[PDB]
Design a protein around this ligand. Structure first.
Ligand SMILES: Cc1onc(-c2ccccc2Cl)c1C(=O)Nc1ccc(C(C)C)cc1
Ligand SMILES: Cc1onc(-c2ccccc2Cl)c1C(=O)Nc1ccc(C(C)C)cc1
Lengths: 229, 240
């Protein structure tokens, strides 16, 4: 009675900070608290995957001081969240052009992956330096190279093959596509998040800002989802 | 205690609108009519919306007329749907042409019945010089299948040394999608409307619609009129 894979666009961190007379960066720290709550609660509820839109390709255009702060969050606050998620049997993974992340950020995410790699509970999947069209492009580029290198023929080119070349290929086969996509902070649009995988997803929009998105809010999103069927 | 006064307010009209025309069958069944009666009523709604959007300054309307999954519906229902542009051509096309509307289609349109394809081709050829709104029918269309065929064509061009794999970019992919014949700055919908209360993605323009505004209404497609389109444009204006 729960969606197996939930995609989340965690909007409203800056707006939340602003409403509280705090610098925008504080909102992103508060967003980590909300994700911790949602990840733990979704794991208890039976959700298999959460893919979060943690950092888009367009987020690099934000002020340098803001990007640096955001990139430092898994580095500085690793001990505050990761051991607890691991104790909760949560598996941490990432998708995106993650090689372009600062050395320390990549190291912090890799350390968290390696720690939780044997965990059998919910997969918390971070979309980092991620863009949907860029993901499809790199898949379509690789398939072309494989075709040119005779590893596959052009008759092998199918929707199923494309799915195996997307960043989501490492998720179990039946769990690659989100059943539900949640978007907070009232924006009614996808912003290049999982365009291929989310082509049939149910969509849930809330005016609730991401740092305020808790267990009760996730239970509402799940309740609405089950009412769609 | 209030007074009715008109105000001059600047509103941005979306250049390209995508529409998933859901609720034809629900509309007909509600009126104790067979589902097929609803699809005929859907033609009336599209005529109203197309003419009104053309006057409003909308450049493109891409409608989800027939998906790849719609072939699974009962044979007599599919046959009736396929016959609509064949039998009712004179009822809509000359009027759209008189309104300077350009008719186009996207999808695996070679798989359409001979008569259907002929009726759509006749409408394309008639309106090909028209400079107003482009009414673009997505027929035998699936988003993932569209992306797949674009790769099938791209890999073959790499193999034939027409392009190298380093030429593979987002811009190139856009030139291989079914929407390639729309002017380059108009290929992507600015707004996607979905009627009949479903809040879901249905494999409609996944690449092109990646940044679109989304508008959902409980209004059934045959009941979607000018006032309803104006509300959707109104909603689009109040976004980020
Ligand atoms: C909540 C939460 O639970 N665990 C993490 C985590 C995951 C991997 C490494 C370190 C941490 Cl703190 C985590 C979290 O919010 N991580 C996070 C925070 C910010 C970013 C930036 C790089 C966009 C990336 C990951
Ligand atoms: C409104 C409207 O205005 N003109 C058409 C039209 C467009 C092309 C050919 C013939 C017609 Cl009647 C039209 C319309 O509803 N066309 C239509 C209706 C149904 C179908 C089926 C095959 C899905 C395909 C096209």
């Amino acid at each position: 009675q729960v969606p197996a894979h939930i995609g989340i666009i965690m909007d409203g961190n800056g707006r939340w900070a602003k409403k509280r007379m705090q610098p925008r960066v504080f909102g992103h720290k508060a967003g980590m608290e909300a994700l911790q709550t949602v990840t733990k609660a979704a794991n208890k509820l039976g959700v298999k995957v959460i893919t979060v839109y943690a950092f888009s390709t367009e987020n690099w255009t934000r002020p340098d001081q803001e990007v640096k702060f955001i990139m430092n969050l898994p580095v500085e606050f690793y001990d505050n969240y990761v051991p607890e998620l691991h104790a909760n049997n949560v598996k941490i993974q990432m998708i995106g052009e993650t090689d372009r992340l600062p050395k320390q950020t990549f190291e912090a995410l890799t350390k968290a992956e390696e720690l939780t790699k044997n965990n059998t509970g919910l997969i918390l999947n971070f979309a980092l330096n991620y863009g949907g069209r860029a993901e499809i492009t790199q898949a379509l580029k690789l398939i072309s190279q494989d075709v040119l290198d005779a590893k596959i023929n052009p008759g092998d080119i199918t929707e199923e093959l494309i799915g195996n070349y997307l960043f989501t290929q490492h998720l179990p086969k039946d769990l690659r596509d989100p059943d539900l996509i949640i978007r907070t902070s009232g924006e009614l649009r996808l912003s290049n998040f999982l365009p291929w995988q989310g082509a049939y997803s149910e969509l849930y929009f809330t005016d609730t800002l991401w740092p305020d998105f808790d267990e009760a809010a996730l239970q509402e999103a799940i309740l609405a989802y089950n009412r769609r069927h």
